[PDB]
Amino acid sequence: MEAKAIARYVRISPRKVRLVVDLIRGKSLEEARNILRYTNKRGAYFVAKVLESAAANAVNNHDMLEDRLYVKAAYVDEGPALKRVLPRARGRADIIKKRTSHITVILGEKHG
């Protein structure tokens, strides 16, 4: 058994959230919760919110118990990118790429 939870179209760089994700991959639920809590990063908030929802989905829809699930796997995906202009010296016009994320978090039953 496993429960997914995706957060598409999140305004933030992939490489940036990848760091946060790589921290909790394969971690106990409560253990991960505390990591995101006091972890000094912006990507923390977006991973914590979705991961939190992954638990709700795991419970209210998959008969999984809160006290026995973990992160079977998780990963962020690169969504589209919001290209913007940028006034540069001597009139050069460089495009800036405000990328987006696709954080995925899948929980799972532990053992027996």
């Binding site: 760091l19 946060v20 790589d22 505390n34 006091y38 972890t39 000094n40 990063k41």
Partner: protein
């Protein structure tokens, strides 16, 4: 644009290698005297309080 310029498109392999030490490190926490909550060492905490 000026004198400093990359001579060659760095190989994807060589790039990833650079970000070797790039990996983060999990924060450190400890169970408090109050709740079972995990406080960072040498600190107070919300929803728990402190003494003296």
């Amino acid at each position: 644009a000026k004198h400093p310029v990359p001579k060659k498109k760095t190989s994807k392999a060589r790039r990833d290698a650079r970000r070797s030490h790039h990996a983060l490190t999990p924060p450190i926490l400890v169970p408090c005297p109050e709740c079972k909550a995990m406080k960072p060492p040498h600190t107070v905490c919300p929803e728990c309080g402190y003494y003296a």
